[PDB]
Design a protein around this nucleic acid. Structure first.
Length: 78
DNA sequence: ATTTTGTAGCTACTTATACAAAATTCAGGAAAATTTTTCTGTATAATGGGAGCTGTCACGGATGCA
């Protein structure tokens, strides 16, 4: 019941990385980040949020691939 | 024989009214002024803590068991 450790163990069991490895990331993260602030721009202008579909981005995208792009983009940060 | 009592009386004479605006102040507002609280960034690199405590009990459990 150490709690501190009870979490500390586990984090152990996720393993450390290196700049290069954390570079694929960076891009992806940004790729997701900005994408959203589309999502906010389109928000703020209108309906308060694209937040529909492939139009939940004003951007163009084959919709399934959108959510996907989102996943990888932010999964990087996670 | 004045004096006090009078009566038949007023006029002066003064509250009383009520209003009344004028004061005359007060309160609240409004700022506005400003002071105090918040917010955000920070680029070499940095990647598991602290402690110890060590002398009843009980019981019911004790599942666990061999």
């Amino acid at each position: 019941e150490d709690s501190i450790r009870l979490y500390l163990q586990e984090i152990g069991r996720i393993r450390l990385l290196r700049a290069d490895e954390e570079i694929e990331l960076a891009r992806k993260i940004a790729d997701l980040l900005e994408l959203e602030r589309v999502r906010e721009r389109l928000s703020e202008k209108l309906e308060r949020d694209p937040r529909d579909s492939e139009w939940a981005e004003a951007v163009q995208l084959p919709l399934p691939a959108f959510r996907y792009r989102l996943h990888i983009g932010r999964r990087a940060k996670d």
